[PDB]
Curated annotation (Swiss-Prot), chain B:
Gene Ontology molecular function: protein domain specific binding; structural constituent of ribosome
Chain's gene name: MRPL17
A single cellular component GO annotation: mitochondrial large ribosomal subunit
The protein's name in its UniProt record: Large ribosomal subunit protein bL17m
Any one of the GO BP annotations: mitochondrial translation
Annotated localization: Mitochondrion
Coiled-coil stretches noted in the UniProt entry, renumbered to this chain: none
Swiss-Prot record, chain D:
Mod. after translation: MRPL32 precursor is processed by the m-AAA protease (composed of AFG3L2 and SPG7), which cleaves the N-terminal transit peptide. Cleavage by the m-AAA protease takes place prior to assembly into the large subunit, an essential step for mitochondrial ribosome (mitoribosome) assembly. Proper processing by the m-AAA protease is dependent on the zinc-binding region within the tightly folded C-terminal domain of MRPL32: zinc-dependent folding halts degradation initiated from the N-terminus and triggers the release of mature MRPL32.
MF terms in GO: RNA binding; structural constituent of ribosome
Binding-site residues, Zn(2+): C32, C35, C45, C48
Superkingdom as given in the UniProt entry: Eukaryota
Entry's localization field: Mitochondrion
Key words of the record: Mitochondrion, Ribonucleoprotein, Ribosomal protein, Transit peptide
GO cellular component: mitochondrial inner membrane; mitochondrial large ribosomal subunit; mitochondrial matrix; mitochondrial ribosome; mitochondrion
Gene, per the UniProt record: MRPL32
Protein name: Large ribosomal subunit protein bL32m
Function: Component of the mitochondrial large ribosomal subunit (mt-LSU). The mitochondrial ribosome (mitoribosome) is a large ribonucleoprotein complex responsible for the synthesis of proteins inside mitochondria.
Chain positions covered by the region annotation Disordered: 86-108
Biological process (GO), any one: mitochondrial translation
Curated annotation (Swiss-Prot), chain E:
The keyword Ribonucleoprotein appears for this protein: yes
GO molecular function, one term: RNA binding
UniProt subunit comment: Component of the mitochondrial large ribosomal subunit (mt-LSU). Mature mammalian 55S mitochondrial ribosomes consist of a small (28S) and a large (39S) subunit. The 28S small subunit contains a 12S ribosomal RNA (12S mt-rRNA) and 30 different proteins. The 39S large subunit contains a 16S rRNA (16S mt-rRNA), a copy of mitochondrial valine transfer RNA (mt-tRNA(Val)), which plays an integral structural role, and 52 different proteins.
One record GO biological process: mitochondrial translation
Keywords, comma-separated and alphabetical: Mitochondrion, Ribonucleoprotein, Ribosomal protein, Transit peptide
Chief location bin: mitochondrion
Localisation per UniProt entry: Mitochondrion
GO cellular component: mitochondrial inner membrane; mitochondrial large ribosomal subunit; mitochondrion
Gene transcribed to yield this protein: MRPL22
Family: Belongs to the universal ribosomal protein uL22 family.
Full protein stretch here: 41 to 206 of 206
Name of the protein this chain belongs to: Large ribosomal subunit protein uL22m
Curated annotation (Swiss-Prot), chain G:
Cited InterPro entries: Ribosomal_uL3 (IPR000597), Ribosomal_uL3_bac/org-type (IPR019927), Ribosomal_uL3_CS (IPR019926), Transl_B-barrel_sf (IPR009000)
GO biological process: mitochondrial translation; translation
Oxidoreductase is among the record's keywords: no
Record organism: Homo sapiens
Main location as per UniProt: mitochondrion
Disulfide bond sites: none
Family: Belongs to the universal ribosomal protein uL3 family.
Alphabetical keyword list: Disease variant, Mitochondrion, Primary mitochondrial disease, Ribonucleoprotein, Ribosomal protein, Transit peptide
Molecular functions per Gene Ontology: RNA binding; structural constituent of ribosome
Protein name in the entry: Large ribosomal subunit protein uL3m
Quaternary structure, from the entry: Component of the mitochondrial large ribosomal subunit (mt-LSU). Mature mammalian 55S mitochondrial ribosomes consist of a small (28S) and a large (39S) subunit. The 28S small subunit contains a 12S ribosomal RNA (12S mt-rRNA) and 30 different proteins. The 39S large subunit contains a 16S rRNA (16S mt-rRNA), a copy of mitochondrial valine transfer RNA (mt-tRNA(Val)), which plays an integral structural role, and 52 different proteins.
Length: 99, 152, 287, 108, 166, 148, 305
RNA sequence: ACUGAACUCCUCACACCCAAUUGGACCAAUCUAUCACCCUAUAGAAGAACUAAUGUUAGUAUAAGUAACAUGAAAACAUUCU
């Protein structure tokens, strides 16, 4: 019974570990996990938490690039909010449209 | 708490202790060598020495005669106590008894000891002897002693 | 080189051992009867030139092996590891015997031999060390003495307390190694072949060959250390428990060469002395 | 009071194999120089003591035969003489216990 | 009942090649149906376990337990048979490789209690087994030093892997 | 359960796909019976499918032994030395065909828990993370609070 | 392998020789330290407020009466200073405590019954091993060179002192004797309960509070008696007559030091600050020093005028 | 903003989470009829399946090597003594 019930907990703990490791790497790069994840989503990069943790552990330069992209998009969003209006959209803020 | 208590609690009481010691000591006087439980022999050794002293006191001493009459349940041993043992130890002042531990009793594995009057006619016990003076350590200590004597 | 000398000496020793053991092939049976007080009448049917008094003790019991230091074979003292050569009478001698004199002398010689080995292997390479003799001083003297001639470079150097402690540490290292005292009765010719690079050992071998009727000499090895023995030695260095190179004294006739006498004192496991008694023995041995 | 639960074999092994339970090795054993049998250092040798006890039993049986009855303890010293032995001047005036064997070497 | 211990002495090994280490002799002996508790016998077996034959005999000669005499007799018989039949050169060159006590066939009796009630006694019997191996007793396992202990710790540290990742 | 069962890591016998794919299955021994309802499906498989399977998989030697048997069996021997014995007792032709195809497509590695769904011999290309990655270096390598 | 004692391998001739030699060495070592001030003594600073000097290790000889000039009896215990020497000194920094520490050893014992390390330490110090070593907290002003002997005159009459010792061990004692519990009545139905403890706790907590008074070992622990008056000093035999009782049995070693009570904080002005030095020989002390109120033996019978 | 279910989506597969009760599909072993012939098949039967009834019998544990029990002393083992 424990083995059957442990699959849900295995998935939950895997996601928790991935989130913890992503938080560690983002803090190393000066970002917070919510900011990194949300801004990557806004950049339209759909890397999941498992892959993000793998990149953090094994591809530190790629993860630094991703963190830089997330901070770039975060600052673009801040600029848009500050200068709210019809100002030109941020370069990375632009969203590719699929039909 | 038994601080300073010098007498073992033996037998069925004080009287029974005295009687057990008396029987052991009568056997010791008769045979000149008795094997018995270690504690009982240890307790009776002092009484054996005291009987030797009372025998030294002499036949004419009424107190010594009464002590011997009490302690020797077999009256034939009182002449022995006064005419064989005390004359034997007249030169000595103490240490009339030799007590040595014996391998534990086969029945109940009790700590046993053999107690004998020194100078008895019986075969000598396998007494423990100190290491010979000719051993390595003893010879080195003899060298020490000789060096000190030469210095002084 | 000292290493080459040790290697070649050990090689010659091993060749002599092989020749001696091959001289008597097969297994000739010799009867040795225990003439000792305890376990009387036991006759051992041993292999000639292979079996030893230690093998006799192993047949008897472990206590014999642990407590027996020497073996009187037909009335003569023998090393516990010296192979027997004929049917005979054997009696094991321990330290605590009524008259341990022979065992004391054997232990004393063995301690001197260990001191000599430590002396030879302690000094640095640049300094030459030549062991001259192990005087057969009595036990009453309070210290076993080993005579050595050091390099002329050190003609004014006296070992310090730290140097003596290092010598004791080396001796205790040997004791921990627990090496047997291998023995051989080897002809003076082979003895001279082994010790051709030491005039002192050569002349000592000559004296021994003159003393004995034949030219047979007692050659002993602890480990990689060949030496000439005045007599039988103890089974193993582990017999020693307390061992101290007490001091060193230069002999008065210094004009020919500096004969420096290393004086030490030791006691076996069977006769351990308390700390204070040992300290007094050290003080008396330092003389 | 009664046990509330059965104690497991693991707990029982712990308790009964704790070194406090285990038998202690004795290092006071030594070989008797006289006969070579094992003896504890403080205790007398069993073999030698049995020799002495058997000789004492023989001597005491001879003593009883000579006494001839209870309450006949002598008023003089006693000396044991073996075959081929005659009383000495000191032995004169002492009750002689004759043993029909050679004097033991240990006996003197 | 099982009697494999006795049969263990009947195994015959093939002749050893000249360039092969000499196989130490093994002698299996046992005593069956000893009027003694196996629990009590276990302490004696553990005591003499791993020791040389002479040391085991010395300890047993001066131990006060009843089983000590029985084990001493068994060990003496084992030594005698090892010398006579198993080609063991020296009596003293044997050590107790194995020593255990086994439960024997016990008998049930009745113990009368105070109020017409009773308990079931067990007349306990035990077996005793010994394996004697020729050669000096193996040296006791030395306690692990601080150096080896730290080496083990550092090996544990080095064995670490990045768990739950690529 | 995983704790009560051995486990291994995802792996291939000899890097089976790098240079060329090699069918790990090498031997298939079908113990069948002339008589017995248990091996009816095995008999039909031997009649109608075993030849086609043999010519489809030329790298596998198939030994069909028809002997009195109560439980017809198929023994698959793989290149790595693994031997897997399966019972084709009272199995239809389709079931036997699927089992044989699964054995053919399966490697010889033990069917136990696999710790990771992936196995990389070169997990890092940019350098595995260590604490000193993403840590700036200071002038003359001065540790904090160092005076000189 | 087998354990050994110093007499195991010594012959009949060598046993007495070794005894005599070692006793002579011990007494020679003890005498060699009788002149401390003539052997590079450490600086002798004057007494200052807040200074704590070293104490002694005495031996409880017994008790006796002692009457004061007001016709009042006082039970006074005898503490003999038997071979008391300073052994070790550790400074404030070395010991890490608030005060320096002096080790003091007392009642020389056999060298054959001491550990090898202790024997080495005492050999280096030049003194025979002592039965007990106790640590006294002192200020750096009172540091004394190791090996210096201490004497009963280190204290003086009228001083107040603290004495620490192991109490008489009474073994595993019942609750009634150990804690003075009232127990249960002897009669009126009491079944097998006359000296047992009552309820050990309450039902609610379902346990026994730590520190609950229960039957167990009594005595054989270190206890201190504070503020005992020093009625008298016998310099010839090095004896201190300490007011009242002291913990421990007769012939027990008691650690004696100046009282810590606040009332007696700074009364060490006139006492020998580092320690009394007989080698100084400024004025040979009388055989007996008495407190002012003590009815000295040899004095006229007191009359209450 | 993010975290967060077995909710939902995603890749593949799906009869595969309610007590009493009810319907159904299979089935271990045994015997019988035919098969089969290193363990079986199709059927017919039935003393046809036990982690549980202070269940019954037997074995062995736990409590536990615990509670309890026993032999007056010496000796020549004649005998004497308490
Ligand atoms: Mg009693
Ligand atoms: Mg009834
Ligand atoms: Mg039971
Ligand atoms: Mg009351
Ligand atoms: Mg009642
Ligand atoms: Mg009552
Ligand atoms: Mg989730
Ligand atoms: Mg069926
Ligand atoms: Mg049924
Ligand atoms: Mg069942
Ligand atoms: Mg049931
Ligand atoms: Mg039990
Ligand atoms: Mg209990
Ligand atoms: Mg009881
Ligand atoms: Zn003996």
């Amino acid at each position: 019974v424990k083995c059957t019930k442990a699959r849900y907990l295995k998935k939950k703990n895997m996601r928790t570990l991935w989130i913890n490791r992503i938080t560690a790497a983002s803090q190393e790069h000066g970002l917070k996990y919510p900011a990194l994840i949300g801004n990557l989503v806004k950049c339209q990069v759909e890397l999941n938490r498992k892959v993000l943790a793998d990149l953090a552990i094994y591809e530190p330069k790629t993860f630094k690039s991703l963190a830089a992209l997330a901070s770039r998009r975060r600052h673009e969003g801040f600029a848009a909010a500050l200068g709210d209006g019809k100002e030109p959209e941020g370069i990375f803020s632009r969203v590719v449209q699929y039909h | 708490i038994s601080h300073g208590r010098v007498f073992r609690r033996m037998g069925l009481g004080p009287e029974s202790r005295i009687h057990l010691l008396r029987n052991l000591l009568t056997g010791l006087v008769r045979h000149e060598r008795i094997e018995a439980p270690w504690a009982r022999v240890d307790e009776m050794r002092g009484y054996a020495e005291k009987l030797i002293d009372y025998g030294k006191l002499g036949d004419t001493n009424e107190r010594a005669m009464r002590m011997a009459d009490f302690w020797l349940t077999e009256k034939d041993l009182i002449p022995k106590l006064f005419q064989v043992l005390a004359p034997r130890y007249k030169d000595q002042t103490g240490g009339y008894t030799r007590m040595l531990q014996i391998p534990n009793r086969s029945l109940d594995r009790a700590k046993m000891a053999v107690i004998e009057y020194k100078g008895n006619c019986l075969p000598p016990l396998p007494l423990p002897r100190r290491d010979s003076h000719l051993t390595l350590l003893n010879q080195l200590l003899q060298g020490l002693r000789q060096d000190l004597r030469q210095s002084q | 080189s000292p290493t080459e000398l040790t290697e070649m000496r050990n090689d010659l020793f091993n060749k002599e051992k092989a020749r001696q053991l091959s001289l008597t092939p097969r297994t000739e049976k010799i009867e040795v009867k225990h003439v000792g007080k305890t376990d009387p009448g036991t006759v051992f049917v041993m292999n000639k030139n292979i079996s030893t008094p230690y093998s006799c003790a192993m047949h008897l019991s472990e206590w014999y092996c642990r407590k027996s230091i020497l073996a009187l074979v037909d009335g003569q003292p023998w090393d516990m590891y010296k192979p027997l050569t004929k049917s005979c009478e054997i009696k094991f001698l321990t330290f605590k015997d009524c008259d341990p004199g022979e065992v004391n002398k054997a232990y004393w010689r063995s301690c001197a031999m260990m001191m000599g080995c430590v002396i030879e292997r302690a000094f640095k390479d640049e300094y030459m060390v030549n062991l001259v003799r192990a005087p057969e001083v009595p036990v009453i003297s309070g210290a076993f003495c080993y005579d050595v001639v050091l390099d002329s470079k050190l003609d004014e150097w006296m070992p310090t307390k730290e140097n003596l402690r290092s010598f004791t540490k080396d001796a205790h290292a040997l004791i921990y190694k627990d090496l047997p005292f291998e023995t051989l009765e080897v002809e003076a010719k082979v003895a001279l072949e082994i010790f051709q690079h030491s005039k002192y050992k050569v002349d000592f071998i000559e004296e021994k060959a003159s003393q004995n009727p034949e030219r047979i000499v007692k050659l002993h090895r602890i480990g990689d250390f060949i030496d000439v023995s005045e007599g039988p030695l103890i089974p193993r260095t582990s017999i020693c428990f307390q061992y101290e190179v007490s001091a060193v004294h230069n002999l008065q006739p210094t004009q020919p060469s500096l004969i420096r006498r290393f004086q030490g004192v030791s006691l076996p496991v069977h006769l351990r002395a308390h700390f204070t008694i040992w300290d007094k023995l050290l003080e008396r041995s330092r003389k | 009071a009664a046990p509330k639960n059965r104690r497991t074999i693991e707990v029982n092994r712990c308790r009964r194999r704790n070194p406090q339970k285990l038998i202690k090795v004795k290092n006071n054993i030594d070989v008797c120089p006289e006969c070579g049998h094992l003896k504890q250092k403080h205790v007398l040798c069993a073999y030698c003591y049995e020799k002495v006890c058997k000789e004492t039993a023989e001597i005491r049986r001879q003593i009883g035969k000579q006494e001839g009855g209870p309450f006949k303890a002598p008023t003089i010293e006693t000396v044991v003489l073996y075959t081929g032995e005659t009383p000495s001047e000191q032995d004169q005036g002492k009750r002689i216990i004759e043993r029909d064997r050679k004097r033991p070497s240990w006996f003197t | 009942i099982s009697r494999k211990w006795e049969k263990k002495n009947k195994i015959v090994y093939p002749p050893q090649l000249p360039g092969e280490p000499r196989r130490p002799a093994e002698i299996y002996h046992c005593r069956r149906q000893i009027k003694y508790s196996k629990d009590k016998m276990w302490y004696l077996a553990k005591l003499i376990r791993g020791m040389s034959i002479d040391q085991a005999l010395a300890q047993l000669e001066f131990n006060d337990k009843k089983g000590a005499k029985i084990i001493k007799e068994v060990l003496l018989e084992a030594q005698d048979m090892a010398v006579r039949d198993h080609n063991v050169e020296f009596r003293s060159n044997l050590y107790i490789a194995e020593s255990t006590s086994g439960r024997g066939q016990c008998l049930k009796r009745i113990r009368y209690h105070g109020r017409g009630r009773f308990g079931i006694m067990e007349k306990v019997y035990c077996h005793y087994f010994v394996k004697l191996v020729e050669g000096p007793p193996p040296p006791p396992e030395p306690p692990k030093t601080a150096v080896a202990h730290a080496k083990e710790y550092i090996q544990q540290l080095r064995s670490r892997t990045i768990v739950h990742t690529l | 359960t995983a704790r009560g069962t051995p486990s291994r890591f995802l792996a291939s016998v000899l890097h089976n796909g790098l240079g060329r794919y090699v069918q790990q299955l090498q031997r298939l021994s079908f113990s069948v019976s002339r008589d017995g309802a248990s091996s009816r499906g095995a008999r039909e498989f031997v009649e109608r499918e075993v030849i086609d399977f043999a010519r489809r998989n030329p790298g596998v030697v198939i030994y069909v032994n028809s002997r009195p048997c109560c439980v017809p069996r198929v023994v698959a021997e793989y290149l790595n030395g693994a031997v897997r014995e399966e019972s084709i007792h009272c199995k239809s032709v389709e079931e036997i065909s699927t089992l044989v195809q699964k054995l053919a497509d399966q490697s010889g590695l033990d069917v136990i828990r696999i710790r990771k769904p992936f196995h990389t011999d070169n997990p890092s290309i940019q350098g595995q993370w260590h604490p000193f990655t993403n840590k700036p270096t200071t002038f003359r390598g001065l540790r904090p609070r160092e005076v000189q | 392998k087998s354990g050994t004692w110093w007499d195991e391998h010594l012959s009949e001739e060598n046993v007495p020789f070794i005894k005599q030699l070692v006793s002579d060495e011990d007494k020679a070592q003890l005498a060699s330290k009788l002149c401390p001030l003539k052997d590079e003594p450490w600086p002798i600073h004057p007494w200052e407020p807040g200074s704590f000097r070293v104490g002694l290790i005495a031996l409880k000889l017994g008790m006796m009466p002692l009457w004061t000039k007001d016709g009042q009896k006082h039970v006074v215990t005898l503490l003999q200073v038997q071979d008391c020497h300073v052994l070790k000194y550790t400074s404030k920094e070395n010991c890490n405590g608030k005060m320096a520490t002096l080790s003091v050893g007392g009642k020389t014992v056999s060298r054959f019954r001491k550990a090898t390390s202790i024997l080495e330490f005492y050999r280096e110090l030049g003194l025979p091993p002592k039965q007990t070593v106790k640590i006294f907290n002192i200020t750096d002003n009172a540091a004394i060179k190791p090996g210096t002997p201490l004497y009963a005159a280190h204290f003086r009459p009228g001083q107040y002192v603290d004495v620490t010792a192991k109490t008489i061990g009474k073994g595993f004692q019942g609750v009634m004797k150990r804690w003075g519990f009232k127990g249960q009545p002897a009669t009126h139905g009491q079944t097998k309960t006359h000296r047992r403890p009552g309820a050990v706790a309450t039902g609610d907590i379902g346990r026994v509070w730590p520190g609950t008074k229960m039957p167990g070992k009594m005595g054989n622990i270190y206890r201190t008696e504070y503020g005992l008056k020093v009625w008298r000093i016998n310099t010839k035999h090095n004896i201190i007559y300490v007011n009242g009782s002291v913990p421990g049995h007769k012939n027990c070693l008691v650690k004696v030091k100046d009282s810590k009570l606040p009332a007696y904080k700074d009364l060490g002005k006139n006492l020998p600050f580092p320690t009394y030095f007989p080698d100084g020989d400024e004025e040979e002390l009388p055989e007996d020093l008495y407190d002012e109120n003590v009815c000295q033996p040899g004095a006229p019978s007191i009359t209450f005028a």
